[PDB]
Symmetry: C2
Subunit: 134 residues, 2 copies
């Protein structure tokens, strides 16, 4: 029961990927994967409301050659179940910059040093309503 999957995004550095979606009223978690393909993700965005013992916490990671990297969590959680949310993503050689709903912003190291983001896959309790490329 997965969601949107888009390839050939060809998102270059500095370019902004904007994703707007509807967070389910009883959402437990949702995921946005970005990278080259399903085995090579420069970013695994997985805001968790309550799903893996975790409660209202944003979990980030990367996957290189099928291998998950060292997980990373953010303190803030600007996501409300039953509400519409937008996340804006960009990157450079050193970091991916993720801009969340209430202005909050954070960087995730660009572990794969990807030339461009060509793959995106959404999953979970987040119904994509709009996706804008640069």
């Amino acid at each position: 029961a997965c969601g949107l999957v888009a390839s050939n995004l060809n998102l270059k550095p500095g370019e902004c990927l904007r994703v707007r979606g509807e967070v389910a009223p009883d959402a437990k978690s949702f995921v946005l994967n970005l990278g080259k393909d399903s085995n090579n993700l420069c970013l695994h965005f997985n805001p968790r409301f309550n799903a893996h013992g975790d409660a209202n916490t944003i979990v980030c990671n990367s996957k290189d050659g099928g291998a998950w990297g060292t997980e990373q969590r953010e303190a803030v959680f600007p996501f409300q179940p039953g509400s519409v949310a937008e996340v804006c993503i960009t990157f450079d050689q050193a970091n991916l910059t993720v801009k969340l709903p209430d202005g909050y912003e954070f960087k995730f190291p660009n572990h794969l040093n990807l030339e461009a983001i060509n793959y995106m896959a959404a999953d979970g309790d987040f119904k994509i309503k709009c996706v804008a490329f640069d």
Copy 2:
């Protein structure tokens, strides 16, 4: 490989799929494919500015199990090279409807009778900049 490819769209009857893109300045033609998957297309939207023996003419067709159906040709050609084009697509038991802001709208028989559009692909001189679902 080509332009943006998106799957798992899960567009249902009546729901509007809006696509905004940039037509290349040297646009010879561009394609918007909609269907179940790459081999099952309820709509192959192909405006041809100057491709094949065609000039400034829209060609539409379907694809069933990999086999192309019979093409349909339009007289109206509301497209221009090096410009932003916007299309609004929907469907029902009878036809697929492609609308433009100018007021132009094309109808193509729903040959496959699919009850959902899960696949969308862009090819040619059309770069997708935004896609909105329902």
